[PDB]
Amino acid sequence: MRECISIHVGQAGVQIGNACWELYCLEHGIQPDGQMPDDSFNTFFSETGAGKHVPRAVFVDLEPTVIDEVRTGTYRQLFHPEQLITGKEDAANNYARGHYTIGKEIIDLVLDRIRKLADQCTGLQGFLVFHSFGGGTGSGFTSLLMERLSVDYGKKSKLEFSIYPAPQVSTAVVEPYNSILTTHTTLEHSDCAFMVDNEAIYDICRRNLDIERPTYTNLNRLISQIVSSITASLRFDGALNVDLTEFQTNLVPYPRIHFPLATYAPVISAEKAYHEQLSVAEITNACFEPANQMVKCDPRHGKYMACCLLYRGDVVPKDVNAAIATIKTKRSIQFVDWCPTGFKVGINYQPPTVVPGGDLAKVQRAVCMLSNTTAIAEAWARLDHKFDLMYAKRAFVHWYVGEGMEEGEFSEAREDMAALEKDYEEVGVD
Amino acid sequence: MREIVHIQAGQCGNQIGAKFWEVISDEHGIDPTGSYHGDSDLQLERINVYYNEAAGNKYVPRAILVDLEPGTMDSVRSGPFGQIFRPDNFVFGQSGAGNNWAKGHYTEGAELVDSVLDVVRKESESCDCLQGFQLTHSLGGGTGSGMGTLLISKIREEYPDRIMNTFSVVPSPKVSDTVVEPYNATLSVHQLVENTDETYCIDNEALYDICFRTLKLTTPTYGDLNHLVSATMSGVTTCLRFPGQLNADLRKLAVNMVPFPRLHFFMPGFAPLTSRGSQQYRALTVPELTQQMFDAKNMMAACDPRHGRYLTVAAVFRGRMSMKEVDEQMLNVQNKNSSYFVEWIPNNVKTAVCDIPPRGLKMSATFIGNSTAIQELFKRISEQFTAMFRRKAFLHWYTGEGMDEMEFTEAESNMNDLVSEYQQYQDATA
Ligand SMILES: Nc1nc2c(ncn2[C@@H]2O[C@H](COP(=O)(O)OP(=O)(O)OP(=O)(O)O)[C@@H](O)[C@H]2O)c(=O)[nH]1
Ligand SMILES: Nc1nc2c(ncn2[C@@H]2O[C@H](COP(=O)(O)OP(=O)(O)O)[C@@H](O)[C@H]2O)c(=O)[nH]1
Numbered sequence: 001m002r003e004c005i006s007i008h009v010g011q012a013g014v015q016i017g018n019a020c021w022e023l024y025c026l027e028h029g030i031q032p033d034g035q036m037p038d039d040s041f042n043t044f045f046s047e048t049g050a051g052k053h054v055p056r057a058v059f060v061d062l063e064p065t066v067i068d069e070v071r072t073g074t075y076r077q078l079f080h081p082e083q084l085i086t087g088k089e090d091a092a093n094n095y096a097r098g099h100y101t102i103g104k105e106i107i108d109l110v111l112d113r114i115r116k117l118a119d120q121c122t123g124l125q126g127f128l129v130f131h132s133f134g135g136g137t138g139s140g141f142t143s144l145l146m147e148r149l150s151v152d153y154g155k156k157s158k159l160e161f162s163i164y165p166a167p168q169v170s171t172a173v174v175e176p177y178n179s180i181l182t183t184h185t186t187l188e189h190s191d192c193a194f195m196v197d198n199e200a201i202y203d204i205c206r207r208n209l210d211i212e213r214p215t216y217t218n219l220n221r222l223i224s225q226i227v228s229s230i231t232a233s234l235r236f237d238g239a240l241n242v243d244l245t246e247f248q249t250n251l252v253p254y255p256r257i258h259f260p261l262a263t264y265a266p267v268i269s270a271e272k273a274y275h276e277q278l279s280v281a282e283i284t285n286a287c288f289e290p291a292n293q294m295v296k297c298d299p300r301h302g303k304y305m306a307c308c309l310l311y312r313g314d315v316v317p318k319d320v321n322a323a324i325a326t327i328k329t330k331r332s333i334q335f336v337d338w339c340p341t342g343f344k345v346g347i348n349y350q351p352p353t354v355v356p357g358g359d360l361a362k363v364q365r366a367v368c369m370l371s372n373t374t375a376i377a378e379a380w381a382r383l384d385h386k387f388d389l390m391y392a393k394r395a396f397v398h399w400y401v402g403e404g405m406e407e408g409e410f411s412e413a414r415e416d417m418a419a420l421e422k423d424y425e426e427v428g429v430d
Numbered sequence: 431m432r433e434i435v436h437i438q439a440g441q442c443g444n445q446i447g448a449k450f451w452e453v454i455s456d457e458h459g460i461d462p463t464g465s466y467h468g469d470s471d472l473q474l475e476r477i478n479v480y481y482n483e484a485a486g487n488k489y490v491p492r493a494i495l496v497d498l499e500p501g502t503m504d505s506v507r508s509g510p511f512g513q514i515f516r517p518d519n520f521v522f523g524q525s526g527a528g529n530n531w532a533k534g535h536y537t538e539g540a541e542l543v544d545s546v547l548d549v550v551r552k553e554s555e556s557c558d559c560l561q562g563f564q565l566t567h568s569l570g571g572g573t574g575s576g577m578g579t580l581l582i583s584k585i586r587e588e589y590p591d592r593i594m595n596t597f598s599v600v601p602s603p604k605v606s607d608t609v610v611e612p613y614n615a616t617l618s619v620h621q622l623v624e625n626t627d628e629t630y631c632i633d634n635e636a637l638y639d640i641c642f643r644t645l646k647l648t649t650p651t652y653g654d655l656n657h658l659v660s661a662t663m664s665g666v667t668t669c670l671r672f673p674g675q676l677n678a679d680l681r682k683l684a685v686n687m688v689p690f691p692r693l694h695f696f697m698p699g700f701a702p703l704t705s706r707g708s709q710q711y712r713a714l715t716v717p718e719l720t721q722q723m724f725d726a727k728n729m730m731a732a733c734d735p736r737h738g739r740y741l742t743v744a745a746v747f748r749g750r751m752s753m754k755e756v757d758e759q760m761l762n763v764q765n766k767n768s769s770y771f772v773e774w775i776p777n778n779v780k781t782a783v784c785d786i787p788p789r790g791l792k793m794s795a796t797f798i799g800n801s802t803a804i805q806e807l808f809k810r811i812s813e814q815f816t817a818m819f820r821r822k823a824f825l826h827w828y829t830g831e832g833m834d835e836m837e838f839t840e841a842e843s844n845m846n847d848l849v850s851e852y853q854q855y856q857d858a859t860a
Contacts, residue, residue, distance in 0.1 A: 088431075213754045
């Protein structure tokens with residue numbers, strides 16, 4: 001009943017998946033071994049006959065290190081070995097290697113395992129995908145898996161918690177190639193995706209979490225907190241719940257434009273927990289600031305289609321309505337004439353659950369805000385500007401060419417992104 | 431992409447490879463008998479990349495030693511760790527080539543190339559998921575250069591799917607065994623660029639200069655150069671011998687570094703330089719070394735990067751890191767020398783951080799760069815070959831072994847084509 005499958009591919013994908021599943025099992029009081037000391041956990045979990053609960057997800061990669069780390073980590077007894085897919089030869093920062101040359105030897109096993117997991121699912125609702133744009137595995141393998149799943153199922157929703165590479169955390173120089181190729185490939189195949197810029201989380205950790213130098217651990221803890229705030233609606237119940245079908249309904253102008261921008265509040269470090277906790281009005285007023293989104297964009301330029309809210313903790317609806325009324329008076333918010341209003345409001349009375357030993361501090365209440373806008377265009381603008389700088393001299397092209405690729409793919413992906421940004425300004429003009 | 435096999439040839443190459451193994455075993459806590467003797471678990475995590483497990487807990491290098499002169503091989507077991515290498519690796523000749531390429535290529539290279547391919551096969555299907563092959567060898571010496579050409583040709587026609595690295599010892603006019611070196615040097619560099627994809631240009635000119643002016647050695651013997659050779663060429667492998675999210679494998683190294691299929695030559699550098707027995711260095715701060723990377727005086731390729739533009743830059747830091755200031759040094763270096771980086775490759779200056787430091791030094795930073803400025807070495811060898819070849823001298827020995835001057839003409843034309851590629855990529859705008 002209402003099952004939802006999670007897909008984790010690539011190093012970053014599996015790292016953030018481990019973090020998010022840890023937060024999920026902690027929130028629902030699920031022990032690290034899966035034992036029970038809302039009944040919506042069955043959407044994200046499968047109940048073994050012994051009473052143990054194992055997540056209905058999968059760990060896929062072409063590299064054996066991080067999978068082995070999971071196999072010897074805290075939750076090694078949580079997941080069965082079969083959904084922890086292990087490769088031998090990695091894509092090595094190459095969309096082509098992770099798509100054609102090497103992915104083919106593993107995609108068959110991957111889809112067999114996905115079907116095996118789905119065998120226990122009756123009311124399957126959709127697919128959650130976690131993958132880094134920069135990584136060759138998490139781009140080529142992600143794109144081909146997206147194509148295969150769309151062939152297999154199609155109309156079923158297929159989410160994507162995409163990771164946007166950032167120069168501070170970037171590990172390869174071919175990252176714009178991989179991001180362009182994967183987004184051009186999955187744009188038709190993905191109905192809604194989440195586009196989180198790791199520079200945003202990095203500088204939030206630098207400033208808000210006062211981390212001297214953010215690491216993968218803190219980045220992924222923050223990312224998992226935000227993803228948990230997003231998925232609380234599927235993992236709990238609310239007055240106006242949002243589901244994957246509802247995600248598509250309330251956050252898609254056109255199938256091409258399916259990249260909502262998210263903001264989550266608040267961000268208080270554990271070392272400063274003694275300070276007065278922020279109010280609903282305070283968090284609403286601090287939500288739209290350029291230091292709280294998922295990408296390094298200024299929402300002032302953009303115009304919101306609809307503003308979706310998800311509230312966590314002890315939040316009173318009356319003050320929510322007051323805050324919404326105050327915010328609507330702001331000149332920052334602008335709605336297209338075609339879309340009058342889409343202000344869905346969701347309240348989760350469950351207080352947020354903090355990770356033990358985490359930099360962030362426990363708060364009584366929290367809110368995460370979803371709203372897509374034309375301000376998101378600047379991320380693709382800088383990204384495809386980097387791609388154009390790449391392609392003006394055909395740098396690194398031979399590495400793709402030697403693995404079943406030609407420059408025609410580069411050209412068609414670049415023009416597809418040009419059409420996508422074209423749609424961006426076109427919907428942004430009344 | 432899991433393991434590396436080693437091949438060394440030529441007395442220079444054999445000596446430098448032996449010293450490399452000395453350094454690697456010492457930093458990984460490997461005793462002469464192969465048993466672990468370190469003090470941390472970091473070394474043993476990735477010890478498999480350069481070693482094989484043996485009876486009990488003995489670790490043996492995956493090094494196949496080849497040489498045509500018995501003196502070199504007697505010497506190579508004469509030194510330390512002469513017994514750790516298994517006798518199977520030792521497949522050798524007796525005639526001696528003596529500064530000639532084609533004669534050792536055909537008249538005497540056939541009867542041992544079969545054996546070396548047999549042993550590298552035994553290693554290969556003994557190995558599970560090897561990344562590729564890295565070779566250290568001399569270029570001016572006809573023996574080592576010819577053996578290296580044989581090995582590269584056979585391994586590429588046998589294992590074209592493996593990223594096959596190599597390390598090059600460019601001949602030096604100042605320290606030259608003979609004068610007919612540029613013939614074999616040009617032939618071997620032609621074969622190298624036309625057949626390999628990863629090479630480090632370690633010219634003895636730069637080594638002699640740095641050991642003379644900076645080490646205050648009036649007559650630096652081959653051991654004096656070999657000390658710095660071993661230090662830096664362990665430094666390049668630091669990213670391949672310890673955990674790290676940068677430069678995990680040889681394939682990732684290629685994808686990150688080399689932008690063009692033909693141009694794949696490297697210009698290795700490392701600071702701080704350390705003499706033999708000189709341990710007066712204090713705790714060197716990051717700013718001085720990160721401004722010292724721009725220097726060509728600490729460069730192990732006889733070229734000056736100030737005359738060219740960096741394509742892609744790699745560097746690894748070892749010691750205690752407050753690497754926030756390291757990132758600050760990146761920012762300052764970029765903002766101050768963007769003119770020396772190609773604008774059409776953004777975010778090409780990436781570095782990692784390592785915690786294991788070299789021996790006797792608590793701070794170190796290798797500097798691996800790929801720039802068009804390396805064309806100075808090829809211009810030097812081109813002018814040498816032309817000024818000593820327009821007389822059509824010394825060709826009797828080669829022409830007596832089937833060599834035809836058309837091969838010389840095509841090789842020199844191809845290498846001038848590489849020089850032209852350097853020139854055209856250097857002046858490319860944004
Ligand atoms: N969100 C997130 N991104 C990360 C993390 N670690 C690395 N990345 C980014 O992910 C990109 C690289 O992708 P990978 O994590 O290596 O995943 P992959 O597709 O398997 O790539 P390969 O390991 O080379 O096969 C780089 O831009 C990294 O900066 C992380 O802990 N979280
Ligand atoms: N750094 C270094 N260079 C060497 C060494 N031996 C020879 N060379 C240089 O390499 C060239 C000679 O190559 P050689 O070692 O004779 O190759 P071989 O014929 O295969 O033995 C000369 O330019 C020498 O100056 C050495 O032990 N160390």
